[PDB]
From a paper:
[FeFe]-hydrogenases represent one of natures’ most effective classes of redox enzymes catalyzing the reversible reduction of protons to dihydrogen (H2) at turnover frequencies of up to 9000 s-11–3. With their low catalytic over-potential, [FeFe]-hydrogenases represent excellent models for a regenerative and likewise economically feasible H2 production. Their active center (“H-cluster”) can be structured into a standard [4Fe-4S]-cluster ([4Fe]H) and a diiron site ([2Fe]H). Theoretical studies suggest that the most probable PT pathway comprises of strictly conserved residues E282, S319, E279, and C299 (from surface to H-cluster, numbering corresponds to CpI), including two protein-bound water molecules (Wat826, Wat1120 4XDC19, chain B) located between E279 and C29915,16,20. In this study, site-directed mutagenesis (SDM) is used to investigate the PT pathway of two [FeFe]-hydrogenases, namely CpI and HydA1, which represent the largest (M3) and smallest (M1) type of monomeric [FeFe]-hydrogenases, respectively.
Corresponding to earlier crystal structure data, for all CpI variants a space group of P1 21 1 was observed with two copies in the asymmetric unit cell (chain A and B). For the same PT pathway position, different substitutions can have a dramatically different impact as exemplified by position E144HydA1/E282CpI. Here the exchange to glutamine diminished enzyme activity to only 0.4–8%, while the non-conservative exchange to alanine and the conservative exchange to aspartic acid retained between 46 and 81% activity. In E282A, two water molecules occupy the space of the missing carboxylic acid group (chain B, Wat717 and Wat974). The distances between these water molecules and the hydroxyl group of S319 are 2.5 and 3.1 Å, respectively. They are close enough to rescue the PT activity between surface water and S319CpI further downstream the PT pathway. As a consequence, Hhyd with its deprotonated adt-NH ligand would be stabilized in presence of H2 (E279A). In case of the corresponding exchange at the surface-exposed glutamate in E282ACpI, two H2O molecules (chain B: Wat717 and Wat974) invading from the solvent are able to bridge the gap of the missing carboxyl group (E282A and Supplementary Fig. 13a) thereby rescuing a large fraction of H2-release activity (~50%). The fact that E282ACpI is rescued by an H2O moiety while in E279ACpI and C299ACpI the gap in the catalytic PT pathway cannot be closed, is probably connected to the superior accessibility at the protein surface and the specific functional requirements (such as e.g. pKa) of the position to be rescued within the PT pathway chain. In case of E282CpI, a substitution for aspartic acid shifted the optimum only slightly to pH 7.5 while an exchange to alanine or glutamine rendered the enzyme most active at pH 7 and 6, respectively.
Numbering used by the authors: 2 to 576
């Protein structure tokens, strides 16, 4: 094929779109509604408009290149078309970037600046209450910012296949939202926040917990613990112009101390706990020849998916609490026993790459004697915002260490944030538990990677067992519906709602689609975790000294008695 673009001749054999071919050859073509290899089929944004000689104006993002095409990407007609579309978007957009949470990384603002577009008449809604939905424990909608680009709908479709995010006809105009415009929590929505990640503007956000945290910090009698998820140390640096794949653990500890948190712990400790319980439970099921399979339960998105689509699997879920909740429980029980603090004055805050964690933390039964396991959950973005608001020079901070009591962790706990990490850690402990030995080779590279469905045959003590890692909610649906679950007998199955694992969580920093083309964000974020695992002395959860001390001195033997009674949570289906 011979393609003429802006007077430049190309000879190619590729069968692709104008947009992709142009961007492969460093030709600038703007785009908005195009993301995840699809656009808004109904109301195309037409920001990707180009001029094809003989045909007229076309959308580059969904138009294949053809031999003889003469394309102009920067003609006056094209620019006036694009500018017109952007102006029409501005007509329904509250253009107040000042207090906006996407001010520093908004795509729409970049487009407005680029094409110098102005609204025909500024959209200044006086009461935004009709435009805002904050009923959810995880997600919030601000339709004064919504461009109706459909990116959240497509992302929900491709990531979860639930289509919990839909186009709706409200009042006679189109909005996006949950089924029947209900609160997302009350639908089949997983609260995974992939829709947020896909959003180019501030229309979709996480349910803020920053005020809980601030009020707790400023409350004289409250002792505020903070603990960050595995993924946070591999991600937040992005929001401080430090680049991708940068380990910023120590800087985070320092920043948290400067924020005024009273205790600095780590969720990876909780991960080691979860492994302590779950590996024990797995060995128990192995020696009892059942029941099989056992599913992980640490992902609240997956838990909600099971609740809403496969309740019969609820009794197959591990009873071990997630690292977050198990850490919280221990923070309300064990921690006061080694600190002298009044448990009621303890306020436990987690930092998560996840929006669903907010819902998990606010589950009614996630408490004991009137004390919440977790009192607040802030996302990576929220923590970054809190750091910036405090004018803390994050990139220049010196490394500090976490408080040891519930802050030490192994590499096994460290790799939790990546798909297949929980599986690998769990196997590392379970083999040692079952064989009553301390094995050398602990790396299970078969369960790693971005493959949607991963399988492995592991040999434990005498026999062989089948494990599966489900990478993404849509892949859970595929795994179940295709009957892959019935092809063989599975014994242990990991499920993560977000493809790539928690490193690609709904509470993670937004990334420019261009940088998304430049960088494999999932592998790069996971690389930090695996690198931490490689260079750590202890690489098994049961080799965690602080954790071993905690079990020996307080909880006793895992998987039973005190440990089972306090550190476990069971989901029950309804009759
Ligand atoms: N609880 C918990 Fe987890 C741990 O440890 C996080 O904190 Fe994850 C991450 N990163 C998130 O959110 S949840 C799913 N299990 C894998 S990792
Ligand atoms: S969504 Fe973007 S363009 Fe709209 S107010 Fe916020 S920063 Fe400005
Ligand atoms: S919420 Fe965001 S992603 Fe969804 S249609 Fe509106 S602007 Fe697009
Ligand atoms: S939170 Fe997840 S399941 Fe719910 S609408 Fe958004 S992408 Fe879909
Ligand atoms: S994979 Fe991780 S970030 Fe995504 S919903 Fe599950 S726990 Fe949250
Ligand atoms: S980016 Fe092509 S129609 Fe929206
Ligand atoms: Mg299309
Ligand atoms: Mg305080």
């Amino acid at each position: 094929k011979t393609i003429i673009i802006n007077g430049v001749q190309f000879n190619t054999d590729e069968d692709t779109t104008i947009l992709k071919f142009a961007r492969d050859n460093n030709i600038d073509i703007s785009a908005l509604c195009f993301l995840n290899n699809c656009n808004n089929d109904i109301n195309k944004c037409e920001i990707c408009t180009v001029e094809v000689e003989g045909t007229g104006l076309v959308t580059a993002c969904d138009t294949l290149i053809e031999d003889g095409m003469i394309i102009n990407t920067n003609s006056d007609a094209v620019n006036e078309k694009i500018k017109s579309r952007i102006s029409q978007l501005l007509d329904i957009h509250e253009f107040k970037c000042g207090p906006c949470n996407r001010r520093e990384n908004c795509e729409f603002l970049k487009l407005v600046i680029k094409y110098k577009a102005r609204a025909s008449k500024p959209f200044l809604p006086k009461d935004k209450t009709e435009y805002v939905d904050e009923r959810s424990k995880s997600l919030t909608v601000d339709r004064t910012k919504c461009l109706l680009c459909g990116r959240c709908v497509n992302a929900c479709g491709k990531n979860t296949e639930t289509y919990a995010m839909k186009f709706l006809n409200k009042n006679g105009k189109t909005i996006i939202g949950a089924e029947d415009e209900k609160c997302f929590d009350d639908t089949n929505c997983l609260l995974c926040g992939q829709c947020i990640i896909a959003c180019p503007v501030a229309a979709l956000s996480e349910k803020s917990h920053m005020d809980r945290v601030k009020n707790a910090l400023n409350a004289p009698e409250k002792h505020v613990i903070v603990a960050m998820a595995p993924s946070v140390r591999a991600s937040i640096g992005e929001l401080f112009n430090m680049g991708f794949g940068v380990d910023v653990t120590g800087k985070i500890y320092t920043a948290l101390r400067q924020l005024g948190f009273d205790k600095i712990f780590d969720i990876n400790f909780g991960a080691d706990m979860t492994i302590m319980e779950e590996a024990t439970a797995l060995v128990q099921r192995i020696e009892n020849n059942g029941p099989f399979p056992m599913f992980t339960s640490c992902c609240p998105g997956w838990v909600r998916q099971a609740e809403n689509y496969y309740p019969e699997l609820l009794n197959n879920l591990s009873s071990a609490k997630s690292p977050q909740q198990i850490f919280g429980t221990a923070s309300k029980t064990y921690y006061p026993s080694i600190s002298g603090l009044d448990p009621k004055n303890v306020f436990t805050v987690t930092v998560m790459p996840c929006t669903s964690k907010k819902f998990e933390a606010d589950r009614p039964q996630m408490e004991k004697d009137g004390l919440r396991d977790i009192d607040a959950v802030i996302t990576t973005r929220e923590l970054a915002k809190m750091i910036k608001d405090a004018k803390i020079p994050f990139a220049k901070l010196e490394d500090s260490e976490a408080d040891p009591a519930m802050g030490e962790y192994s590499g096994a706990g460290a790799i939790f944030g990546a798909t297949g990490g929980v599986m690998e850690a769990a196997l590392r402990s379970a083999k040692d538990f079952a064989e009553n030995a301390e094995l050398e080779d602990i790396e299970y590279k078969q369960v790693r990677g971005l493959n949607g469905i991963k399988e492995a045959e592991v040999e434990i003590n005498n026999n062989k067992y089948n494990v599966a890692v489900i990478n993404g909610a849509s892949n859970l649906f595929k795994f179940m519906k295709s009957g892959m679950i019935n092809e063989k007998q599975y014994h242990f199955i990991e499920v993560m709602a977000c493809h790539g694992g928690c490193v690609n969580g709904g509470g993670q920093p937004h990334v420019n689609p261009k940088d998304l083309e430049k960088v494999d964000i999932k592998k790069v974020r996971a690389s930090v975790l695996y690198n931490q695992d490689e260079h750590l002395s202890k690489r098994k959860s049961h080799e965690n000294t602080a954790l071993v001390k905690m079990y020996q001195n307080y909880f006793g033997k895992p998987g039973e008695g005190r440990a089972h009674e306090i550190l476990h949570f069971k989901y029950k289906k309804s009759a």
